[model samples]
Target: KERVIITGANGQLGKQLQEELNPEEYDIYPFDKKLLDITNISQVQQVVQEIRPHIIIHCAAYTKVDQAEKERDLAYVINAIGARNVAVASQLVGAKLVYISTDYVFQGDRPEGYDEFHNPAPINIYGASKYAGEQFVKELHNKYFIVRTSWLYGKYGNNFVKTMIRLGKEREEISVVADQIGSPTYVADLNVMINKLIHTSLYGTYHVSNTGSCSWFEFAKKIFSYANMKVNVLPVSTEEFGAAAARPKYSIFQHNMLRLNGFLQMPSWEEGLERFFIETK
Candidate 1:
């Protein structure tokens, strides 16, 4: 059996990976914060030594976007240093590394969606940290896949979809940013695609988002429409949204590498949302 180590097992993507991946085919070691903390280099090294994994799926991250601005040290420590530690450990053990990244790495100034070839110019601390991680992974290991995704929502954790649903049920109306546009990728979809990627020998950065794009307002409206909720989703500008961290106004990604590599393409965002509703129900 191929040995696989998954960090951040308690997180949304990690949790979905646990559910989707087969136990019979691989020797899976899913570690949450209690089992392993990537920030601790020695601890990570010891775990890697013991596991001697064929692949390491790095899902652990400091994902608190706005909070990252206030806590830059923690963000870089976890996102950058932690990633370096994992990559080094994986390389030492001769393991393929899979790094989960965000669309925040891009400045979102591009009128068109960013593709795999685009140069990253992060506008926020959160994005800078993640990009630093990407750089470390790229430098330390040759057999690594740095998968960048955006607007993730899953049943295992709190996300925009669940938040909108909860707020819709509680309040009469809510305002969402209409200026920001990106693909709202489902965690389930991401994990499934990742599963396929790991089976192959392809290595490099890839943009793996659901096809199509929409603003937060449109996303919220669709969520309500699909869930049969009668909440009024009001459109607002990014300025009115008032986030602590500067978000990309257009973070849409083109899954160019996925297609270029001849891998299966992700489903549309609408289809993903539709399936999410069905799965949740």
Candidate 2:
């Protein structure tokens, strides 16, 4: 049986991965930050040597976009240097490392969508830091999988889907930006793709998200419709939303790598939302 160690076990994706991965096939050690701090290199190596895991799925990250501007050191510590620590630990144990990245790595100017070959021009501290992490993973390990995703929503933690549902239930009208377009990823679906990627020797950077892309306003409307809520989701411009962190206007990933790998595409965003409705119900 393959031994797998999952970092950031307390996170939404980590938690979902724990639930979704086949327990019978692998000996799983889901370590939360309290148990395994990625920033502490010595401690990470200590744990890695003990576990001797064949695979290490890295999920620990500093995800606060706006706050990352102010807390640049923290972002780098966790996202970049922290990833280096994990990569080193993986290297010690000959473990296949899976580094979770973000679509924010792109500049967002390409309306045609970015593929794996596109050059990354991150616009914010969070994106910059995550991109740094990607570089660290590539330099540190021979076998690595860097998976980039966008707008993740899952049952374990707060996300756009849950936020929309809460606001829709409490208020009659909600404003969302229509200018920014990207794919929305479901954690469950992401877990499936990750599993498939790990089982194969195809180790490289890949973009994975629910099929189809839409603006945040369209997503909110769909969320309301799926939940059977009579809420007015007003379409607003990105400028009007005024987020502190600069976002890509068009960050939809082409998923060309996943397609070329002969892996089945993840279900559509609409289908994921329907499943999310069932999950919540």
Candidate 3:
């Protein structure tokens, strides 16, 4: 039947995965957190055994930035322990696993875009937990791919693009963080890349963000431009903005694997934003 199991089906990314997976081509089973409690090891293992999926995409994650600091245990439980459960379960079921990761694992000190081999040194609890999950999956499961990306936005969830458009209309001016920089990822395009990875026999970490990088201010400026809202965008530093969760100053990732292998076909952020604006509007 070629069953594909996607956990955390209610999340932004997981929802996008469900939207991308066509039921006619592949048997897709999407489980929300309430339906399949990944924190419960017995339940996870039992579900894996029952489904016996060919590809198990572990999409569940603890994504709250500020809350992660206070709720470290919960973050570790879902991001770390849950990852272990899925990896070990995949091993038992002999299924290939895809662990979605983030660029926050890096310190953002590097001026150039980070590659797969770059050493990770996360600054915040959320990044640390996600990194822990990535490490566990890599060490435990031989047949696993760690797909890392940054600055994700989509129609399903509230993101930078939507936020900028909405705010641009309400306000005459907006202050955006210009110092922080990374590649913006369109979830719609990202879903296509994921499907491609699953179809191929590729196994290893891959960076799958939209090509090119931009700061928050620039991204917001583009959003306003798309929405036809004339607003002055003031570029502010991350220190001035003051977020509860520390962000990487420059966490852009270079798609060395995609370039070297020739599978990197995700469009640039500007093109992606244009398409998203037309569809979403």
Candidate 4:
């Protein structure tokens, strides 16, 4: 059986990876922040060297985007330095590395969509940190799969979908950002993508997200309608939202790598959301 080690095992993606993979096929080792503090290089090296797993799906990260603006060092240490720790360890033991990233890595300068070959010019601290992590993965090893996703929400964690559902029930009207656009990728869908990706030696950066894009306002409306709830969702611009960090105006990916590599693109954002509603029920 193949051996697999998943960092950030308590996170949405980590939990989804566990749910999706067949236990009989792989000896799975899950490590949350408590079990594995990725910022501790010596500990990372020790754990990885001892287990010497076939794959390391690195999901641990400083995911607090808004807070990252005020805490740049914390973000960099966890996202960039910590990633280097995992990458270097993976390289040492010949384990395939999967570094999960975000759509924030793009500058979103163009009105059009982005693809894998496009250059990254992040607009904020969180984006810059994750981009730094990407650089580490590319530099450290040949057996690396840098999987970038956007607007993720899943069963095990607090995400946009859950927040919307909560706000709908509490407030009569809710404000949602309409200017910024990206796909709301389902975590399990990404797990399915990860499972398919690790099978081959096609090591490169790729975007595995839902097919289409929508502003947060449009997404919130869909969520309310699907949940059989009614709320006045007001469409507001990014500037009006008053967030601490500056996000990309348009970070939708074209899935060029997946298409060129002959892998099927994920379902549309709405289709993925529908499944989420059904599964939660």
TM-score for every candidate vs. truth?
A: 0.97, 0.98, 0.96, 0.97
**Cα-based lDDT for every prediction:** 0.90, 0.90, 0.85, 0.90
Q: Which lDDT tens digits does candidate 2 get at residues 1-281?
A: 99999999988899888989999999999999899999999999999999899999999999999999999999999999999999998988889999999988989878878899988989899999999999999998989999999889888988898888787888978888998888788898899899998898899999999989788989889888878899997888878777889998888888898999998888998887788878778
Query: How far is 163's C-alpha from truth in model 2 (Å)?
Result: 1.4
lDDT, model 2, position 6: 95
**Candidate 2 Cα errors over 4 Å, as ranges:** none
lDDT per residue (tens digit) for residues 1-281 in model 3 = 58899999988888878977888888899999987888888989889999898998888998898899899999999999989889999999888899999988888767687889878888889889999999889877888879998888887888878777777778888898888877788888888888888877689999898878788888888877777789999988877766888888787888888777679567998887887877776
What clash count goes with each model? 0, 0, 0, 0
Q: Report the Cα lDDT for residue 75, model 2.
A: 94
- Expressed as tens digits, the lDDT of each residue in 86-175 for candidate 4 is 999999999999999988888876666778988988888999999999998899878989999988989877889999887789999999
Off by over 4 Å in 1: none
Candidate 1 weakest ten by summed lDDT: 233-242
Displacement of residue 48 (Cα, Å) in model 4 is 0.8
Enumerate residue pairs that collide in model 1. none
Q: Distance from true position, residue 40, model 3, in Å?
A: 0.8
Q: How close is candidate 2 to the true structure, as a TM-score?
A: 0.98
Least accurate stretch of 10 residues (summed lDDT) in model 3? 257-266
What is candidate 1's lDDT per residue for 109-146, written digit by digit as tens?
Answer: 77677888889998899899999999999988889999
